[PDB]
């Protein structure tokens, strides 16, 4: 299932719960251990996916502010959960920083990340 | 407060209502252009609740999964962008829309676009 | 309809020829005036588009190196030409910088631009 | 070097020549089929990259029209070449289809692909 602890290619970890209603709620930790690198995450998923072998669509956001740090930026991940033995969540993400109007053209990075339940 | 809480309209007529929490939470309801109650979906997200005061915008993002009690598109959109407050407040976003696919078909799983929202229409 | 001079909302301009064979060839000026700000553009377009009112798919690339400057970057624009009283090319773009593998996660910006045809 | 034959995860292949002047030219072949599935590619690359362990920025376009078929669409790939033992080209891409105005919101797919010179 989606609920659990997930690991990114380069060590990021996130813990999420998938609610009956389609909610995602949890915490995203940018660096292994370390209280100062944990951030709130919230999102949504398709709680009644197709039964044709497709994945389950989802997305979530982290604003990079906690009680210790603020990067004045937020990342959204959009993707799907693929169940099985080696369950995976495959994503593409957008990272937007607060900018002046003149710098808005360079406000947003794009990338991709794959998460697995194994370290 | 920050001026995010309220009702916002995009260039295509979609509208959303949002409440910005003092802690960084975004909650609300997104209504696609066509349909009324059949077209309302849950939205949830996060924003920078302590933004810079140097002329920069306020970073945010939110997600809508396209399932409600009427319809299910087996898809979800995430919007990433910044809020520009004041007299002519706007939220400028780029978005990704992922539909559930097999891995073989994942190359056609994700659309990209951009939406600008105003508190006016 | 594509052949000609085009300008975007932020002031950049380009001049392009759409060849009978599908080629796009031209010059991109990142800043109106200023002859040290011209770069080679090349790309491709659909030379036999649908006749149902749909736009014409196209794309092009500029590497940001010329005789005077080198940003070690390249932008690609993907979009469609929409004919009209005021013709437009509506695009989304990706700007990738050369990075170390460690910084590859922040190698690529994403944005959008609309160009309007001069005269 | 960039010049050579490259392979994608799910069977696409392309052949490219990198000119001394920053030009990319070649042919892209979709996974299934052959000449029916071969298309012209053109692009640009940084012909003098940084000497600091950074990759080499590049981009190219394919319009999905050849003598046999026409999908009324085009893909642009933006990325970088990373040299050495296992040389790779890492990209993100945008695929735009010609659409009516009402369908323009869903004109553009986004993805990512890595290419290698090995099988």
Residue numbers in the entry:
A (entry chain D), C (entry chain B), D (entry chain A): 16 to 134
B (entry chain C): 14 to 134
Article excerpt on this structure:
We previously generated streptavidin heterotetramers with exactly one, two, or three functional biotin-binding sites, through purifying tetramers containing defined numbers of non-biotin-binding “Dead” and His6-tagged wild-type subunits. However, tetramers with two functional and two Dead subunits can assemble in three different arrangements. To generate a controlled and stable bridge for bionanotechnology, we demonstrate here a method for the simple isolation of streptavidin variants with precise cis-divalent or 1,3 trans-divalent arrangements.
However, in the 1,3 arrangement, both sites are in a trans configuration, pointing away from each other. Second the C-termini are close together between subunits 1 and 3 (27 Å) but far apart between subunits 1 and 2 (57 Å) or subunits 1 and 4 (50 Å), so that elution from the ion-exchange resin would be predicted to occur later for the 1,3 divalent. SAe was refolded together with Dead (D) streptavidin (N23A, S27D, S45A). For the 1,3 trans-divalent form, crystallization with 2-methyl-2,4-pentanediol (MPD) gave us the desired asymmetric unit. The obtained 1,3 trans-divalent crystal structure was solved at 1.6 Å resolution, and cis-divalent streptavidin was solved at 1.4 Å resolution, with the phases in each case solved using molecular replacement. For the putative 1,3 trans-divalent, the electron density closely fitted residues 23, 27, and 45 only if chains b/c were SAe and chains a/d were D, confirming that the biotin-binding subunits indeed had a 1,3 trans orientation. In the overlay, Asp27 has van der Waals clash with biotin and there would be repulsion between the Asp27 carboxylate and biotin's carbonyl oxygen lone pair.
